């Protein structure tokens, strides 16, 4: 019966590296990537790196994805220095990481019910230390806090869950960014020029290549449909 699996990603610091970050400078994206959540469920399964290559990619690539952003966190930068190995010489790697501070995201994945049920069951019993993109970003709220349910459309699922205010008088977000998978529908119906591209679908890391994906953005506003 449950078609959609909900994941809650909330913490003080989080970082989801975007496709345009490959130099010593590493920035982050505003929303979690498909690669990151795929890695999170892969860690929850506990399958190794080499197990994916053994005809396993399309069993998870078909999962329709949708990201809900509750609060927009400002981009915070961290200066990281690596001593690597310390015959020997003064070689210190230069790095700068980008972190999203005070941000909360909701990830909804749509698929056949048995796979979703098994995904939730394995999430409730994580065999490996899960994080929020980087090992130094633990989840401040349970990932399985919102339980799977039967909802026809992603908009109905997003609007059904109420928003919990931290205290009585706080500035609520009048703009709610959202990320949803682009439905191909029938054969054809090419994506318009206004559809953005995203490289977060891993199939192999030798050579490292990520297949591009199309992401479209939507709006949800509270107080307009519920009296």
């Amino acid at each position: 019966p449950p078609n959609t699996l909900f994941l809650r990603l909330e913490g003080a610091l989080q970082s989801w590296g975007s496709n345009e970050a490959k130099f010593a400078l590493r920035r982050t994206a505003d929303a979690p990537t498909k690669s990151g959540v795929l890695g999170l469920l892969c860690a929850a399964m506990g399958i190794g790196r080499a197990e994916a290559a053994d005809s396993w990619l399309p069993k998870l690539a078909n999962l329709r994805m949708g990201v809900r952003i509750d609060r927009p966190g400002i981009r915070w930068w961290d200066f990281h220095t690596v001593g690597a190995g310390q015959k020997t010489r003064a070689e210190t790697l230069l790095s700068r990481r980008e972190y999203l501070a005070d941000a909360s995201f909701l990830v909804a994945l749509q698929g056949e019910p048995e796979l979703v049920a098994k995904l939730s069951a394995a999430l409730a019993k994580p065999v490996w230390a899960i994080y929020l993109g980087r090992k130094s970003c633990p989840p401040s709220r349970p990932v399985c806090e919102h339980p799977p349910g039967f909802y026809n459309t992603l908009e109905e699922a997003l609007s059904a869950v109420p928003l919990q205010k931290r205290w009585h008088n706080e500035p609520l977000p009048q703009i709610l960014p959202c990320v949803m998978d682009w439905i191909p529908g029938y054969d054809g119906e090419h994506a318009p020029d206004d559809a953005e591209i995203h490289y977060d679908l891993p199939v192999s890391f030798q050579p490292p290549r990520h297949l591009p994906r199309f992401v479209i953005r939507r709006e949800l506003v509270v107080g307009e449909d519920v009296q």
Binding site: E10, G11, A12, L13, G73, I74, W76, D78, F79, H80, G85, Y99, A101, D102, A124, K125, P126, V127, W128, A129, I130, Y131, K135, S136, C137, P138, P139, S140, R141, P142, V143, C144, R166, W167
Partner: protein, 255 residues
């Protein structure tokens, strides 16, 4: 099973971690600027400790080129607003000359905060790379506990001797990795009738009691200085006043 370690450590005015400009590492949380010690800083502070030096050594605990080290550590999030300060300094010439003042006459950056440190070490994978040496795995877990309890980052320590030990450490064995950073979404404001450490521990206790009420956890404070709940109800499994018996309790619970 998962071992999660939470620490509440209050540090004297110091500069433990630094950026390029010399400012203390900072972060944003709850609409408030907050001090920060990076996770890699704490990890390196754990390593290169003489307490442990006195399978393959130096490989199972930290990998070297996989190994997939099982110990994870979060960024040290302060419980309150960050308060950076200016340290105006000069370096004297201590000789009679035609002028006065000789040093760079700089402005050092420093701050003092009560940091919430999160350590999550999973027993299963640490056993996995230990070839099933449960005794050795427990020994290394205890050694890491002792180190994290009694070690500090080797930052600007010769001028800022900040060697304060944590006033409260809480160890839980829950199935999912939950960090208690959200316990401090509201920044802690010090009142006249309480102190910063007591208020932070009280906020952590309030967060622990909430959500669940609408697993078990070992609470350690030095000589029970800061009790995590002053009641006889089933709130904390064991109140431990000594570090070594806390490590012993963790060890014989794991094994």
């Amino acid at each position: 099973m998962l071992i999660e370690i939470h620490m509440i450590q209050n540090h004297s005015p110091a500069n433990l971690n630094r950026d390029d400009l010399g400012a203390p590492k900072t972060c944003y949380f709850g609409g408030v600027l907050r001090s920060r010690i990076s996770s890699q800083c704490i990890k390196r502070s754990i390593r290169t400790s003489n307490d442990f030096k006195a399978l393959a050594p130096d490989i199972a605990l930290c990998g070297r080129m996989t190994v997939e080290a099982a110990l994870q550590v979060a960024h040290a999030i302060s419980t309150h607003i960050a308060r950076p300060e200016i340290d105006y300094f000069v370096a004297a010439d201590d000789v009679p000359g035609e002028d006065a003042g000789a040093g760079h006459i700089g402005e050092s950056m420093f701050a003092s905060a009560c940091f919430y440190k999160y350590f999550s070490i999973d027993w299963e994978q640490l056993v996995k790379n230990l070839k099933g040496d449960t005794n050795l795995a427990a020994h290394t877990v205890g050694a890491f506990l002792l180190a994290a309890a009694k070690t500090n980052p080797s930052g600007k320590q010769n001028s800022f001797a900040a060697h304060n030990y944590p006033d409260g450490i809480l160890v839980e064995f829950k199935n999912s990795p939950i960090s208690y950073a959200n316990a401090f979404v509201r920044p802690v404001s010090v009142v006249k009738e309480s102190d910063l450490v007591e208020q932070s521990i009280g906020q952590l206790s309030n967060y622990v009691n909430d959500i669940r009420l609408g697993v078990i956890g070992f609470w350690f404070s030095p000589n029970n200085r800061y009790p995590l709940g002053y009641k006889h109800s089933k709130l904390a499994s064991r109140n431990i006043g000594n570090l070594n018996e806390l490590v012993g309790a963790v060890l014989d619970y794991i094994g």
